[PDB]
Structure 1
Amino acid sequence: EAEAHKCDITLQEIIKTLNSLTEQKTLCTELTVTDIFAASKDTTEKETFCRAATVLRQFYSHHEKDTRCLGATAQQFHRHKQLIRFLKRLDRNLWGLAGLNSCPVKEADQSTLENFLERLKTIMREKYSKCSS
């Protein structure tokens, strides 16, 4: 009964977390983030999760302070806060299983937070091929 299925339970709570975000849709989606898969060549999966976090980083870090996705209503003020938290969460889960010290960002084209979360979620389920086939 020891173990061998190194199934990373983190990639699980993460995939489910992304779905919870898809259910939520604020004007913060009209924002364009920096794409990372538009320039992947010798970069391995490691640097892939890092770059992804770097983006989400300057995302809820610069916007949360900008009165863009804040609005003025009271129902949007809270709904927005909950969003920033969801990002601040997976943002750590990713950079967590990474464990990378140096990881400077390069350059790329652009992508919408929506399509960006789509190709990303799909990629995850693509690499999610392991003890769970």
Structure 2
Amino acid sequence: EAEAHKCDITLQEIIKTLNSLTEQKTLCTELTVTDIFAASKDTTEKETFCRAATVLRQFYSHHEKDTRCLGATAQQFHRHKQLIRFLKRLDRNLWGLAGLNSCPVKEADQSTLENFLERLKTIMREKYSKCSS
């Protein structure tokens, strides 16, 4: 089924979705998140995708039905379901390519969902330029 590669087209749409996840960078990113980009000795690109894929998992399960991220507006609701569908999509498109179920992401200080979403985009733009071989 593969022809050229599974990193130019698939991962490409995964990067665009990455920037879309930074739309709610104010009320939903006020909580926190492990800093996987705080001390990365020498992990792999597929291991980094699964790690951030687990953190994103809990982000689309509870924060989608939590009131802390809801707010208090009729338009904020219709816009919320939009970020929940884009996030759950990247959940399988990020690690689905990695190939690693076990992903112990419980070793890091309490970073912020903001600085983490920024380092997520950057990491996808410089690391995605090394999938070919």
TM-score if structure 2 supplies the norm length? Answer: 0.82
Does 96-105 or 117-126 show the bigger shift? Answer: 96-105
Deviation per residue, 1:8-63 (Å, 9 max, x gap):
31210011112233345451121212221223224222221111111111122122
Q: Highest Rg: 1 or 2?
A: 1
Pair 1:119 & 2:80 matched: no
User: Where does structure 2 lack aligned partners over 5 or more consecutive residues?
Assistant: none
CA contact (8 A) 1:33 1:59 kept: no
Structure 1 consecutive aligned stretches of length 4 or more whose deviation exceeds 4 Å = 1-7, 23-26
> Following the alignment from structure 1 to structure 2, what is the Cα–Cα distance between the partners of residues 131 and 54?
22
> Following the alignment from structure 1 to structure 2, what is the Cα–Cα distance between the partners of residues 114 and 89?
20
Percent of pairs identical after alignment? 100
CA contact (8 A) 2:46 2:95 kept: no
CA 1:2–1:112 in 2, change beyond 3 Å: closer, same or farther? closer
Distance apart, 1:90 and its partner CA? 1.0
CA contact (8 A) 1:26 1:80 kept: no
Pair 1:26 & 2:20 matched: no
CA contact (8 A) 1:63 1:69 kept: yes
CA contact (8 A) 1:50 1:95 kept: yes
CA contact (8 A) 1:70 1:80 kept: yes
CA contact (8 A) 2:34 2:106 kept: no
CA 1:2–1:99 in 2, change beyond 3 Å: closer, same or farther? closer
CA contact (8 A) 2:49 2:95 kept: yes
Distance apart, 1:91 and its partner CA? 1.3
Show the counterpart of 2:130: 130
Aligned CA RMSD, in angstroms, stands at 2.9
Distance apart, 1:112 and its partner CA? 2.1
CA contact (8 A) 2:54 2:103 kept: no
TM-score if structure 1 supplies the norm length? Answer: 0.82
CA contact (8 A) 2:18 2:120 kept: no
